[PDB]
Design an enzyme around this catalytic site. Structure first.
Site, PDB file in Angstrom:
ATOM      1  N   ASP A   1       0.834  -1.188   0.000  1.00 14.78           N
ATOM      2  CA  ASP A   1       0.000   0.000   0.000  1.00 14.78           C
ATOM      3  C   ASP A   1       0.883   1.257   0.000  1.00 14.78           C
ATOM      4  O   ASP A   1       1.350   1.723   1.068  1.00 14.78           O
ATOM      5  CB  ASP A   1      -0.909  -0.001   1.209  1.00 14.78           C
ATOM      6  CG  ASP A   1      -1.903   1.096   1.174  1.00 14.78           C
ATOM      7  OD1 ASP A   1      -1.754   1.926   0.186  1.00 14.78           O
ATOM      8  OD2 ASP A   1      -2.776   1.131   1.975  1.00 14.78           O
ATOM      9  N   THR A   2       1.188   1.781  -1.187  1.00  9.71           N
ATOM     10  CA  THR A   2       2.065   2.983  -1.290  1.00  9.71           C
ATOM     11  C   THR A   2       1.379   4.223  -0.728  1.00  9.71           C
ATOM     12  O   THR A   2       2.101   5.225  -0.502  1.00  9.71           O
ATOM     13  CB  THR A   2       2.477   3.190  -2.753  1.00  9.71           C
ATOM     14  OG1 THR A   2       1.310   3.358  -3.560  1.00  9.71           O
ATOM     15  CG2 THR A   2       3.279   2.019  -3.274  1.00  9.71           C
ATOM     16  N   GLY A   3       0.075   4.215  -0.516  1.00 10.69           N
ATOM     17  CA  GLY A   3      -0.627   5.314   0.131  1.00 10.69           C
ATOM     18  C   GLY A   3      -0.646   5.262   1.655  1.00 10.69           C
ATOM     19  O   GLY A   3      -1.216   6.152   2.259  1.00 10.69           O
TER      20      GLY A   3
END
Ligand SMILES: CC(C)CN(C[C@@H](O)[C@H](Cc1cccc(F)c1)NC(=O)O[C@H]1[C@H]2CO[C@H]3OC[C@@H]1[C@H]3C2)S(=O)(=O)c1ccc2nc(NC3CC3)sc2c1
Lengths: 99, 99
Positions: A25-27
């Site tokens: 999850d890069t967010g």
């Protein structure tokens, strides 16, 4: 590996002696896991996302294996609807975005 | 480009004739933007995240430019704390994870 985004980017992790699936999850700045039994001391923390906030337990210096790569860092445990591997751990395994 | 994860992976987008910054968010299935004026018909939708849910306006077939790449798709507008580019758009620009 390389992972495309046609499906959710879910990988297998080992943490606290237990196996789980989690989203790359890069967010997510931090790593957040659904209720899981981890050893030792923790600190209560409120964290915010879409919809509002949750109370989590913060555990520090927790080893995790993420798709066969070793990392150590902070894991937050609480009522997240999804297990998410955040940037604090992704940076340790050399995870990049490419387009 | 290649984007590492030492910082939030924020890029410039153009949508609805307007410029914004948004997070490349592999943990987001959909694209969600803070209040922004978009043209035409929309449908109310409830969406869930960490903390609970929000009411959004769903706009379909919205063109967006994401770091200089062209895409078209659904954009949800509502009280998200961050503008997020999700997999519905990331797949169109050829965005992958690598480690
Ligand atoms: C919203 C982003 C900005 C942040 N979130 C990471 C996003 O990837 C989450 C992951 C997710 C997926 C599924 C269900 C969920 F409940 C959550 N996706 C998400 O909500 O998607 C929503 C939305 C997009 O379309 C569809 O797809 C899933 C669901 C649905 C509608 S986070 O989970 O809130 C988070 C994580 C770590 C973190 N560490 C912090 N550290 C302190 C500041 C330093 S703050 C913080 C906040």
């Amino acid at each position: 590996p390389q992972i495309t985004l046609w499906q959710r980017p879910i990988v297998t992790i080992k943490v606290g002696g237990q196996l789980r699936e989690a989203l790359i999850d890069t967010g997510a700045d931090d790593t957040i896991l659904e209720e899981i039994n981890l050893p030792g001391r923790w600190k209560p923390k409120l964290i915010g996302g879409i919809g509002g906030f949750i109370k989590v337990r913060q555990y520090d210096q927790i080893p995790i294996e993420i798709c066969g790569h070793q990392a150590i860092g902070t894991v937050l445990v609480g009522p997240t609807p999804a297990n998410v591997i955040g940037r604090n751990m992704l940076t340790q395994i050399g995870c990049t975005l490419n387009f």
